[PDB]
Amino acid sequence: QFAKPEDAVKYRQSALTLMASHFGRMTPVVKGQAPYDAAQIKANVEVLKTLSALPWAAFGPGTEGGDARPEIWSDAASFKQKQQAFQDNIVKLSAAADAGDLDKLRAAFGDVGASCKACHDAYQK
Amino acid sequence: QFAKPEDAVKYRQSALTLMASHFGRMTPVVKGQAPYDAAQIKANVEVLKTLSALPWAAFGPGTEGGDARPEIWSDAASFKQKQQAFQDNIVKLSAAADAGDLDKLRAAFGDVGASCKACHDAYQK
Numbered sequence: 001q002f003a004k005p006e007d008a009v010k011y012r013q014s015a016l017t018l019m020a021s022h023f024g025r026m027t028p029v030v031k032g033q034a035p036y037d038a039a040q041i042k043a044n045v046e047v048l049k050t051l052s053a054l055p056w057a058a059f060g061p062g063t064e065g066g067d068a069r070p071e072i073w074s075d076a077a078s079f080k081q082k083q084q085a086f087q088d089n090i091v092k093l094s095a096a097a098d099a100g101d102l103d104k105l106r107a108a109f110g111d112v113g114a115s116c117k118a119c120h121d122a123y124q125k
Numbered sequence: 126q127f128a129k130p131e132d133a134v135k136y137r138q139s140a141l142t143l144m145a146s147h148f149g150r151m152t153p154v155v156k157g158q159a160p161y162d163a164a165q166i167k168a169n170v171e172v173l174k175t176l177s178a179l180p181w182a183a184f185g186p187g188t189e190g191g192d193a194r195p196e197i198w199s200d201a202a203s204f205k206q207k208q209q210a211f212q213d214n215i216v217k218l219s220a221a222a223d224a225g226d227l228d229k230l231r232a233a234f235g236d237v238g239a240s241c242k243a244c245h246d247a248y249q250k
């Protein structure tokens with residue numbers, strides 16, 4: 001869907017920005033600093049679910065650039081495992097949000113955040 | 126969800142970028158230049174649906190900035206009608222995509238695009 005490789009870079013950065021907002025905005029809720037409204041969080045995690053599937057198709061072949069480390073493409077398969085692991089952790093977060101259980105949400109949220117960091121540590125400059 | 130007003134600006138620009146990609150990538154399909162796969166389009170329009178609800182909450186009070194014209198806030202209510210009209214046109218597009226009818230998709234797509242332009246004409250610098 002990208003006319004030039006920089007279009008893919010702009011798309012993925014935008015997706016990751018939105019992901020970060022939908023993930024990070026829950027931090028005060030998981031910490032108990034903002035109230036826990038189960039319906040609010042369920043809705044938000046549904047948006048995060050959708051968003052969290054979007055960046056990976058914009059690291060296609062030939063889309064080298066941005067703050068991506070070249071190893072996204074030089075070890076594409078390690079990168080792929082890290083995206084699928086992250087998405088699997090999003091499934092656990094969705095289940096916790098659908099259950100309406102703050103303890104489960106806290107645990108899942110930490111799992112998701114660890115998965116973000118693991119990919120950054122290897123693939124972000 | 127924004128620590129400072131510029132955070133809202135970055136969020137909305139990112140949402141609108143993603144919206145534009147999910148909308149514009151269908152152009153060759155509606156023009157007949159790329160094949161029409163009803164399941165492909167149905168899935169894509171579901172993503173566009175989700176995305177199309179996201180920018181408006183990031184034009185909150187006090188989030189003046191970006192390439193937004195000041196009138197988004199000085200006539201907030203005209204801006205609001207234009208967002209709700211755009212979202213209503215997204216509903217028609219979703220219905221066309223769910224029906225799997227290329228003629229209906231073409232008509233809805235044109236309706237949506239006209240709604241994008243109508244808002245830009247009044248509110249984008």
Ligand code: HEC
Nearest residue numbers: 013016017020023065066067068082083086116119123124
């Ligand atoms: C499987 C790999 C991977 C996962 C998982 C991942 N990221 Fe990243 N992230 C990247 C890469 C690669 C970049 C740099 C992209 C670029 O500049 O081309 C990035 C960039 C970003 C950016 C900056 C985008 C910009 O505007 O330039 C943010 C914000 C971000 N990530 C947040 C997150 C959050 C929050 C999570 C987890 C909820 C997450 N990421 C999970 C790989 C990942």
Ligand code: HEC
Nearest residue numbers: 138141142145148190191192193207208211241244248249
């Ligand atoms: C109800 C108003 C409204 C509608 C509807 C709307 N836009 Fe916009 N658009 C804006 C405003 C306001 C900006 C500038 C936002 C800013 O810079 O703060 C903008 C900016 C953009 C940008 C640039 C974002 C960036 O990276 O800075 C793109 C791309 C875009 N719009 C595409 C679209 C498409 C495609 C549609 C329809 C599918 C659409 N817009 C519908 C109001 C709207």
